[PDB]
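User: I need a structural model of Crambin from Crambe hispanica subsp. abyssinica for a docking pre-check later this week. Nothing fancy, just the predicted structure tokens so I can convert them on my end. Input:
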Amino acid sequence: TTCCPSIVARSNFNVCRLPGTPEALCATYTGCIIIPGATCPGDYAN
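Assistant: Understood. Predicted structure tokens for Crambin:
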């Protein structure tokens, strides 16, 4: 599951992913985290 700290960070993550750049790297660049479970932590609810 991808979990982002802010709406703008989610927007940056979606932009970074558009050309195909790997989710793990886009998460690093934007501050989003990729976790194994279904429910995002409350500070990463966007």
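Before docking, keep this in mind: The longest strand covers residues 2-3.
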